[PDB]
Amino acid sequence: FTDYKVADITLAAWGRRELIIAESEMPALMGLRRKYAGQQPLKGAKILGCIHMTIQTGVLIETLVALGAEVRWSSCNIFSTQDQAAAAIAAAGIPVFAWKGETEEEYEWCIEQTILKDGQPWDANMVLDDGGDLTEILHKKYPQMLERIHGITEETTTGVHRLLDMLKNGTLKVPAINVNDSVTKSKNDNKYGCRHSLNDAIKRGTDHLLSGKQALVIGYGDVGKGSSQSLRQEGMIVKVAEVDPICAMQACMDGFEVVSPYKNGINDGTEASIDAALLGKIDLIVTTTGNVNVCDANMLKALKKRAVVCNIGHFDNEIDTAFMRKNWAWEEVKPQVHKIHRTGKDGFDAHNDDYLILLAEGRLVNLGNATGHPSRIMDGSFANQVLAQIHLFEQKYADLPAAEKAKRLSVEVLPKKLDEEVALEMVKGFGGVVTQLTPKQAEYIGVSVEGPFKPDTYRY
Amino acid sequence: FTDYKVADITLAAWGRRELIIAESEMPALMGLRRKYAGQQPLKGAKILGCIHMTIQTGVLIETLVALGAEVRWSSCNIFSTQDQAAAAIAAAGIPVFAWKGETEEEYEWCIEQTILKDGQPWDANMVLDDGGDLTEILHKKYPQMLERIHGITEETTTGVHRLLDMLKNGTLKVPAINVNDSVTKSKNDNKYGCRHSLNDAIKRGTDHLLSGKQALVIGYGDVGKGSSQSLRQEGMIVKVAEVDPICAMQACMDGFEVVSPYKNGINDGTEASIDAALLGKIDLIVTTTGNVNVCDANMLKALKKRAVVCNIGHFDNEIDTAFMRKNWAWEEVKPQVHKIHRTGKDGFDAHNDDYLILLAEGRLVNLGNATGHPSRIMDGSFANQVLAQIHLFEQKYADLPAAEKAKRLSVEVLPKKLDEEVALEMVKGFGGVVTQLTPKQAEYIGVSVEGPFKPDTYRY
Amino acid sequence: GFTDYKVADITLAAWGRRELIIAESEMPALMGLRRKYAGQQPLKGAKILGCIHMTIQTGVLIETLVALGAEVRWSSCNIFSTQDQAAAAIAAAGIPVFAWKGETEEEYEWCIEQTILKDGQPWDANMVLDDGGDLTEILHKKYPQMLERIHGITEETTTGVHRLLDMLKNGTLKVPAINVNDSVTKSKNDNKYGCRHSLNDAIKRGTDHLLSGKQALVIGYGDVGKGSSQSLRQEGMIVKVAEVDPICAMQACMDGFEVVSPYKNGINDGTEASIDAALLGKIDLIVTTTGNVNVCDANMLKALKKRAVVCNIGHFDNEIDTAFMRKNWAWEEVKPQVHKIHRTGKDGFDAHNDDYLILLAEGRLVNLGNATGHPSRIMDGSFANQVLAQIHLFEQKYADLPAAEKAKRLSVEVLPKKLDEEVALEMVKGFGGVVTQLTPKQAEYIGVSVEGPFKPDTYRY
Amino acid sequence: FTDYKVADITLAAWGRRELIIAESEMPALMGLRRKYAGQQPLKGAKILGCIHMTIQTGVLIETLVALGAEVRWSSCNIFSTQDQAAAAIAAAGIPVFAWKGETEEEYEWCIEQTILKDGQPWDANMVLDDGGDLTEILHKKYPQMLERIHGITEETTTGVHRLLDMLKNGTLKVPAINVNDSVTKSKNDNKYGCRHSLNDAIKRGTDHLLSGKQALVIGYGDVGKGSSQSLRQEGMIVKVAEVDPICAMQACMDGFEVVSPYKNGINDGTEASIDAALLGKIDLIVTTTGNVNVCDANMLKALKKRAVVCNIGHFDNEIDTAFMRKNWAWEEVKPQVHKIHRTGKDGFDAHNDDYLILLAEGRLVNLGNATGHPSRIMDGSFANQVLAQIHLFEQKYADLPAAEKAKRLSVEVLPKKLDEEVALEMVKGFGGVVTQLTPKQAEYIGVSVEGPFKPDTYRY
Ligand SMILES: NC(=O)c1ccc[n+]([C@@H]2O[C@H](COP(=O)([O-])OP(=O)(O)OC[C@H]3O[C@@H](n4cnc5c(N)ncnc54)[C@H](O)[C@@H]3O)[C@@H](O)[C@H]2O)c1
Ligand SMILES: NC(=O)c1ccc[n+]([C@@H]2O[C@H](COP(=O)([O-])OP(=O)(O)OC[C@H]3O[C@@H](n4cnc5c(N)ncnc54)[C@H](O)[C@@H]3O)[C@@H](O)[C@H]2O)c1
Ligand SMILES: NC(=O)c1ccc[n+]([C@@H]2O[C@H](COP(=O)([O-])OP(=O)(O)OC[C@H]3O[C@@H](n4cnc5c(N)ncnc54)[C@H](O)[C@@H]3O)[C@@H](O)[C@H]2O)c1
Ligand SMILES: NC(=O)c1ccc[n+]([C@@H]2O[C@H](COP(=O)([O-])OP(=O)(O)OC[C@H]3O[C@@H](n4cnc5c(N)ncnc54)[C@H](O)[C@@H]3O)[C@@H](O)[C@H]2O)c1
Ligand SMILES: Nc1ncnc2c1ncn2[C@@H]1O[C@H](CO)[C@@H](O)[C@H]1O
Ligand SMILES: [K+]
Ligand SMILES: [K+]
Ligand SMILES: [K+]
Ligand SMILES: [K+]
Ligand SMILES: [Zn+2]
Ligand SMILES: [Zn+2]
Ligand SMILES: [Zn+2]
Ligand SMILES: [Zn+2]
């Protein structure tokens, strides 16, 4: 019996070739393999994992396994799996349920296949999640499983928000580590990852020249910062929208004009509030917010003909694709690339000029239309994931008495010392040489020679 | 009015012309003037101020005065005063003791003139400092004055470190606000300020082409980040040194090669530990650390002939200028520009090829050889200073009983809401338009429509 | 009824046609020529042998030539550069095309032969459109009687032009040519900005490597090397540049690059001792951009850092000594057009060996081999020039001229600056750009007509 | 020695210090000194020179003198002289008539002092010019002097246009070399020089932050290209205007929005044709064209309040400053910085908000408000000048028989081989290493191993 489901198992050899390359690009993660090999700190760990089934995730999975864990895996997005990576993991004997181009029903089924082994709840004791979907399903549908789970390690900004809401409401059942907010995650992956992979995805989907054209990036947090750079470095004229004036100040100082889709920044919900002159000149819009309906129906109506629309935030509801499905006709160009014809719902003229190009049906475009962030960037994120798994598994929350569990429910980050140790391995991967403080210098600035080098207030 | 000392009072009209321009470049600060003029929240405040006597400081001073304060002012660096600014402030009837090109004895005398009025301690009740020199003098020499002081507002990273050391040792006598760590200060002034003003100062001092040449920036905190950009945007080939691997990871991802002056980063004090091949190719070295002896004697010996050496950190001991004074002959090119001849102490050949060019005798180069950060950047820093002064003055720490002082004796930052309000005014100064969240969107991400928009953990 | 073609898979035609319809919207200069000249049919009677990368962009070029009255027979000028959906869409429109991605060399030559011959005999060709000179060479060496009836050659690329100029110098060029490459809207658009767009694109598609923070060496700093260096630097690479031309090297220095040679003091003595092994041992990526031979040589390949990526974006694969690598080292295909080359020996390799290089597109032009080459909106410039060049030579009717008049016209020329400007204006309008009109006084002041041309022929832009 | 006029001879020692530094930054020029010292190829040359009396020109002058020439010198702009450079040249016994801040009458008088020695025409036999003013004066007022002059070497685009017009009309009396169109001049000086010195000048004059603000650059030739980069690299949002669609295409591809000051690009001279919405958002306008009235009266009226206006083309008539003198009130901020009050001609309110800031009264801003291009860039231009002087002086046009003069009366550029030799010295100055072709490679591409490497048609 094959305890997996993937698109095509014959892609395994290709995937394995790419894993071998990726190992060479992931020194922090491979360093953890070597360092913790002897101890087997994840011996006895049974990890439910839900995160984009890419080559990078493959190296993460095999690191967890190399440190003693067993896992059962699914992707956290319908379009993000690399089928060769899924195949290589399945062929190594690891249960994985993932393919590129899942339906929503298949997506839920894949998560269910990780949770259930041979038709009963798996004896899971750890969770690794990216976006909170697996966390939500366990809490909603398998609450008894959480009695035996020691913790959740959550990858992404959106997932963390959802955890913090559960904690505030008293509905979170196990502790978590916010992996996102290690500096080697948030200020590496979220920013430089998107810098690498946004323009990549747009080129693969459309092959559009970007230089000389007008872009609007909605948001200027870590993803928006990286996204804006991805485009500006290509020669786009990028405008930035924000609701956060500090982030907007950064965009101004970084050389971007800060604009709103709405007249005076006020959305009244009508077309009259749209800055039609602005949107009529935009060739590309990218959403980066983790919020809802930031590229709304009225904005879509006002966009320049033939504009590209995409989202690089975690969930597709940043863009009102439901409005587009209800009202406009979709013409598939190729997979994950649709022309959306604004002439009506029922059919289209093949030579119509009044369309938008939507990438990945509004799902995470970097992963949907390309391969997401590169190995050398994901090295940081995933070294943090491994450290976080070790920490929570060692803490054994599920074995605490009921009264003490109540006291130990938290959402925490990894210590700065570990964040530094990850960064050092990343730096060495580039051939970088960090200088060691003399004793006198360390005394002068008030730190130990080995670090940590900054107070916890430091923002980098 | 005679209660001042400046280089040349006849420069006042020029200074006033420049203050009128700077007011138009400082909307956050001017907005505070207009908003608080009626209420006079600083009525009764008597502020000892020690910060670079520039045009920008002039607008700060006159804002404090417009809100009801009286001040006595000095510069916190011997080369940083703009004499026209000092003159304009003196001519407005405000006690100021500052000029460009002070001796160290004059520097101390100027601070003493703020502390003493007519030969006796002034009835000061507030302190505004940049670097901690005034704060140190008050604690060491005028402890009775601190009994009646409500707080200190400290501008810069180095000054904050000194406060935090005092707090750790139980020697801090009054509460402080860390103005540096507002995002609209640290991630504006320290970074973009240096981006603007480093290349500016080097051009004014040397008129050297930077494009195509090799630079080494020591440090990659906010100043090193801004400094590196200042140089790279001019076409320099910039290498970065760091002791902090997180900051080094950022430098790598930002497109810099990370190097150490020392073989394997080990600074053992020996000549042989210097990477002679590296230093022999460097045309410019810039120190940005806030630490001691980061451009040391052995590094200076190994630098390429005709290299420029400068420091943009707060204090001159980043570079071992004492070694250069003791051993090498100094030839003044023009004010704040010296050729340092490595051939010997006693005289030099006017056509010697083996020299370095030192800017501002190792003191902060942006202020020493140019005019420091631009008005529109200092607007952020100084709007924070004003808000910080208001907050501590209203809290009236000096008048609290002993038991209540114990609860308030701390080093704090301004609330994020105020940091955002400053940023908004900066954004509007650029013509930027921030978007207003809908109530549904604000609920979705868990914030009020008016902000604050981020949790206190957020790093931007 | 139409069968006069050979492509990978005709069922890709609908996809290709969807992409052509998008590309038309990205190519205003080319589409402007279609609309302007449709009525007049200036290429009526033209029979064009075409040899250029069978991409979507070439598809729009082909259909423009056809829309203006031409008939064509087409092949690609590179074994890896065809987009199969584009080839299919062209075949389905009834146009003879012989092209697919992943040709062998024998197939490549056969495809060119299929354009030249129709039903086993020389086609009644009267025009040539070429990219690199291979078709031009075959006609001159093997089909001289066909050249008697050919009015001209329009040549796309720097390499091809060099070959034409050599023929002209030797008195062996049989028909006139237009150097399309040296329109400013080609050379300083396509060769530079095209590579800026498509180099990093190809490297990402092939390897998915992070480029930021890593060390690159770009060999050459002409238009391709300039664009290539920018492609990498804009991604955060630390880029070093090599050049033999000191003017181009001066530009690289001023542009913010360190200028280095693979050889100690720039002198190759042919031995491994002349290699700067310390330099090459730190390089993660090398890119050749020269149009020259063996600029990434065997000794350089031996000295490169383990796991370095090697690629070429010049016209021909001999920039890199891949023959040395085939003879001496073991090739492991990662996926199509991506090979690990194991430096441990010829016969087999360890799957976990660390001492390999990654070669893209077997050393053939990487932007077209591992991605889709330049974007439509850039190729618009190049291809509007191709169309204008075809119109000009076809109208001149060189083949029909008497001997004495042929002597006067047998040359390699560029398009007039006025036309180069007209192409540029349509490109600018495509971006929504608004050019200012000179007043009469201003035009007089600088000595030009209000409509242009705006610069003397000496101007370098 | 009294045969000079400069602002202040006591600045000579400072000038000499700066010349000694500049020599180290000018390897091509110093290489020419060493190479040609023995031959003294300019022995007997008597050169009238008219070009910006900067430190860089000082090194040029002393190179000509070191190769045997005698000279008489003036500046080609009223604001471009560096008084320390003029002083150092006078103190070396060389006739120079130049100071910063000349009136137009003084400017003409200075040129006349070069032409006349001891009250009568000097026995000049060579001319070095920058802009054509000296050339025009010789042709119009001293035609008899041209009978004994062997040639003109002309530095700049505007000067060359004027020569080519003279040649076309049959009014040019001596041959010329177009120094501008060496690649090591035009594509070095005109572009990278302005990149270095435009932002420099704006900072020195105003100390304005540039990041985040809106600029409009009129022109995108070599100067406009370099100017646009100067601003964009600082984080300005730069828009570009052009009449040349090829240059406009380059601006688009380089990442700029191309706009016209006039609606649809049509300049009918009416206020109605101005794009007031566009100009109302511009904080900085820079003219780069070498044309007339490209920043016209109606544009000046429509500019955003407090916009900076400047010109970096050769002559001040790019901007309609005559209109501003006739209609608006000028308030000097400091030398070469004026607020132009749009409220009327006769007086102004010191606190008026409706003004523009004009730099250098519309004269070349880089030289007027800073020091022009850096030594290492001018090295290229001036090595070309020296080679051009050698070539024409050795040809001895004035002494040629009539039939041979006819053949040599032309405006020519230097051979590409020499352009390459200059570039090589510049590259070596950066520590750059050029590769030598193998014999097989040289054969393959059809060039000699030593060069020239490109055909004359090549545009770089
Ligand atoms: N695609 C990827 O590979 C990838 C990588 C990292 C994170 N993410 C996801 O991207 C999203 C953003 O993450 P982040 O770390 O940048 O978060 P963040 O909190 O740093 O930034 C989001 C920004 O959006 C802004 N914003 C919110 N509503 C807005 C509106 N209506 N208009 C304009 N701006 C608005 C906020 O002010 C904030 O600055 C999340 O969903 C996260 O999980 C995706
Ligand atoms: N000149 C200006 O206008 C200006 C502006 C703002 C702040 N400052 C001053 O600049 C200094 C730096 O401030 P900051 O905000 O960047 O502080 P920071 O803590 O953000 O950055 C300093 C960096 O230096 C690094 N460092 C320390 N010792 C080092 C060594 N031996 N080698 C290499 N790197 C080393 C640290 O790791 C740290 O990242 C302080 O003195 C501050 O007061 C100057
Ligand atoms: N891949 C593409 O899409 C594409 C696009 C346009 C042109 N091209 C091709 O790229 C090649 C280059 O074209 P180009 O327009 O840049 O030509 P170019 O003449 O402008 O530039 C080539 C440069 O290579 C330099 N060079 C030569 N030998 C060298 C060596 N041994 N080491 C270092 N530098 C050396 C030359 O000095 C020259 O500056 C040609 O083969 C051309 O056909 C490819
Ligand atoms: N300040 C300096 O140090 C310096 C340096 C080099 C040259 N220059 C001078 O700068 C000027 C420009 O020189 P260049 O080499 O760039 O010349 P150029 O011919 O390369 O460029 C000038 C550009 O202006 C454009 N133009 C003309 N009229 C225009 C209009 N009405 N609106 C918009 N664009 C218009 C032209 O199309 C052209 O592209 C000349 O006067 C030259 O002598 C000054
Ligand atoms: N123009 C300026 N006026 C006043 N302070 C300045 C200026 N430029 C930089 N600074 C300050 O210098 C400090 C370093 O001592 C920084 O914290 C910064 O706030
Ligand atoms: K990837
Ligand atoms: K300033
Ligand atoms: K393409
Ligand atoms: K200068
Ligand atoms: Zn996820
Ligand atoms: Zn200070
Ligand atoms: Zn070709
Ligand atoms: Zn001049």
DSSP C30-59: HHHHHHHHTTT-TTTT-EEEEES--SHHHH
Which residues of chain D have a CB within 8 Å of the CB of C184?
246, 249, 459
Beta bridge partners of C51: C75, C130
Binding-site residues from annotation of A for NAD(+): 156-158, 190, 219-224, 242, 291, 312-314, 366
Active site residue B351: no
Residue A163 gets which letter from DSSP?
H
How many C-beta atoms lie closer than 10 Å to residue C448's C-beta?
17
E strands in C327-377? 330-335, 338-342, 356-360
Measured over all CA atoms, what is the biggest interatomic distance in chain A, rounded to whole angstroms? 76
CB B323 within 8 A of CB B291: no
Six-digit token pair at A172?
Answer: 């979170």
Distance CA A70, CA A144 (A): 20
Place of tokens 């010019």: D129
For ligand 2, the distance from its centroid to the CA atom of residue A320, given in whole angstroms, is 45
For chain D, give the longest Cα–Cα distance.
76
CA distances from C129 to B101, C51, C121, C160 (A): 72, 6, 20, 11
DSSP strand E in D242-283: where? Answer: 257-258
Quote the minimal CA–CA distance from C265 to chain D in Å.
7
- Facing residues of D339 across strands? D331, D357
d(CA D296, CA D317): 10
The partner residue sitting opposite B374, judged by closest CB among D192, D200, D209, is: D209
Residues on chain D touching B334 (C-beta within 8 angstroms): 14, 17-18
Distance in Å from the first CA to the final CA of chain C? 50
Asked if C222 and C190 touch (Cβ cutoff 8 Å), the reply is no
Which residues share a beta bridge with D414?
A: none
Nearest CA among C312, C307, C306 for reference residue C334: C307
Q: How many CB atoms sit inside 10 A of residue B308's CB?
A: 24
Q: How far, in Å, CA of B200 to CA of C193, rounded?
A: 31
Long-range CB pairs of C141-144, under 8 A, 24+ apart, other chains included: C143/C116, C144/C174
Ligand 3 centroid to residue C367 C-alpha, Å: 14
**Ramachandran region, residue C6 (left: φ > 0; alpha: ψ -120 to 50; beta: rest):** beta
Give the Cα separation of D435 and C221 in Å (integer).
12
Distance CA A406, CA B34 (A): 51
Query: Using the 8-state DSSP alphabet, how is residue D280 labeled?
Result: T
Alpha-carbon distance of D408 to C218, in angstroms, equals 43
Q: How many Å apart are CA A422 and CA A129, to the nearest integer? A: 20
Q: Which of B17, B208, B371 minimises the CB distance to D25?
A: B208
H-run or E-run covering C219? strand C215-219
User: Distance between CA D379 and CA D429 in Å, rounded?
Assistant: 10
DSSP assigned state of B263: G
Q: Is C403 exposed, middle or buried (0-12, 13-18, 19+ CB in 10 A)?
A: exposed
How far apart are alpha carbons A310 and A202 in whole angstroms?
9
Q: Which residues pair with B412 in a beta bridge?
A: B177
Contact D211 A253 (CB under 8 A): yes
| Phi/psi-derived region of residue A119, left when phi > 0, alpha when psi is between -120 and 50, beta in every other case | left
The Cα D54–Cα D60 span in angstroms is: 10
Topology at the third CATH level for domain C1-192+374-433? Rossmann fold (3.40.50)
Comparing C-alpha atoms, which of D91, D84, D88, D92 is closest to residue D65?
A: D92
Helices in C314-448 by DSSP H: which ranges? 322-328, 366-370, 376-396, 403-409, 417-430, 440-446
Closest listed ligand to the CA of C455: 4
Q: From the list B17, B195, B209, which residue is nearest D374 (CB)?
A: B209
Contact by Cβ (8 Å): B178, A454: no
> In what helix (H) or strand (E) does residue D367 lie, and over which residues does it extend?
helix D365-369
| Chains A, D: CB pairs < 8 Å | 35
Residue with tokens 């190097």: B259
Tokens 């046009």: give the residue.
D397
A325 CB-near residues (< 8 Å, 6+ apart): none
Q: Indicate yes or no: CB of B184 within 8 angstroms of CB of A246.
A: yes
Handedness of CA A260, A264, A266, A268 (dihedral sign): negative
Structure tokens at B207: 């008129």
Domain B192-372 superfamily per CATH = NAD(P)-binding Rossmann-like Domain (3.40.50.720)
Query: Helices (H) and strands (E) in chain B — how many of each?
Result: 20, 17
D189: annotated active-site residue: yes
- Burial (CB count <10 Å: 0-12, 13-18, 19+), residue D120: exposed
Length of chain D: 460
Q: How far apart are CA B410 and CA B425, in angstroms?
A: 29
Which residues of C are part of the catalytic machinery?
A: 53, 76, 81, 131, 156, 181, 186, 190-191, 195, 315, 374, 382, 386
Name, in order, each residue with C-beta under 8 angstroms of A313's C-beta and a sequence gap of 6 or more.
A158, A219, A223, A287, A288, A289, A290, A291, A364
Protein residue closest via CA to atom 1 of ligand 1: A312
Residue of B69, B155, B147 whose CA lies nearest to B397: B147
**Residue of D186, D227, D381, D384 marked catalytic:** D381
C-alpha to C-alpha distance for D51 and D179, rounded to whole angstroms: 13
Whether residue C367 contacts residue C195, with contact meaning beta carbons closer than 8 Å, is answered with yes
Enumerate residues 6+ apart whose C-beta is below 8 A from A253. Answer: B188, B191, B192, D211, D212, D235
Distance, in Å, from the CA atom of D149 to the CA atom of D143, rounded to the nearest integer, reads 10
How deeply is A78 buried, as exposed, middle or buried, from its count of CB atoms within 10 A (0-12, 13-18, 19+)?
Answer: buried
Active site residue D310: no
The amino acid sitting at B141 is K
Closest C-alpha among A141, A51, A135 to residue A97: A51
Contact B213, B248 (CB under 8 A): no
What are the backbone angles phi and psi of residue B237, rounded to the nearest 5°? -90, 105
Spacing, Cα A224 to ligand 1 middle (Å): 7
Domain boundaries, chain B: 1-191+373-432, 192-372
Residue with the nearest Cα to atom 1 of ligand 4?
D312
Tell me the residues surrounding ligand 6 (ion) with CB < 5 Å.
A 371-372; C 208
Question: CB-based burial of residue A152 (10 Å sphere; 0-12 exposed, 13-18 middle, 19+ buried)?
Answer: buried
Residues linked to residue C71 through DSSP beta bridges, in sequence order: C47
Look at residues A84, A116, A107 and name the one whose alpha carbon lies nearest to residue A315. Answer: A107
Query: Does the beta carbon of B372 sit less than 6 angstroms from any atom of ligand 5?
Result: yes
Binding residues of C: 55, 131, 156-159, 186, 190-191, 220-225, 243, 292, 313-315, 367
Please give the order of strands across the beta sheet that includes C412-413.
Answer: C97-98, C71-75, C47-51, C127-130, C153-155, C177-179, C412-413
User: B127 forms bridges with which residues in the sheet?
Assistant: B48, B152
CB pair distance less than 8 Å for C238 and B257: yes
Superfamily for the C193-373 domain:
NAD(P)-binding Rossmann-like Domain (3.40.50.720)
Q: Which backbone phi and psi does B395 adopt, to 5 degrees?
A: -70, -25
Phi, psi of A284 (to 5 degrees): -150, 130
Left (φ > 0), alpha (ψ -120 to 50) or beta: where does B180 sit?
alpha
Instruction: Please give the CATH architecture assigned to the domain spanning A1-191+373-432.
Output: 3-Layer(aba) Sandwich (3.40)
What CA–CA distances, in Å, run from B218 to A288, A453, B260, B267, C278?
34, 15, 9, 14, 24
Token pair listed for B414: 């301004």
D341 forms bridges with which residues in the sheet? D329, D355
* Coil vs helix vs strand at C289: coil
Contact check, Cβ <8 Å, D212/A255:
yes
**Which residue carries 């006198």 as its tokens?**
A440
The residue written with tokens 């590769």 in the block is D435
Q: How far is the CA of D216 from the centre of ligand 9 (A)?
A: 25
Residue B80 alpha carbon to ligand 5 centre in Å: 9
R_g of chain B computed on alpha carbons? 23
Tell me how far apart the alpha carbons of residues A220 and B185 are, in angstroms, rounded to a whole number.
18
Judge if the beta carbon of residue A372 lies within 6 A of ligand 1. yes
Helix (H, G, I), strand (E, B) or coil at C180: coil
In sequence order, the 6+-apart residues with CB closer than 8 A to the CB of C403 are none
- Burial bucket for residue A116 (CB in 10 Å: 0-12, 13-18, 19+): middle
- The distance of B445 to chain A (nearest Cα, Å) reads 6
D49 DSSP β-pair partners: D73, D128
Q: Which of C372, C368, C409 is nearest to C392 (CA)?
A: C409
Residues of A whose CB is below 8 A from B269: 438
Q: What share of chain C is helix, strand, coil (3-state, %, to 5)?
A: 45, 15, 40
In this complex, do A244 and B438 lie within 8 Å of one another by their Cβ atoms?
A: no
Among D397, D393, D382, CA closest to D42: D393
Across-strand partners of C341? C331, C357
H or E element, residue C202: helix C195-207
Dihedral of CA B200/B205/B209/B211: which sign?
A: negative
In Å, how far are A214, A237, B92 from D264, measured between CA atoms?
19, 21, 51
Of A191, A314, A338, A391, which residue is the catalytic one?
Answer: A314
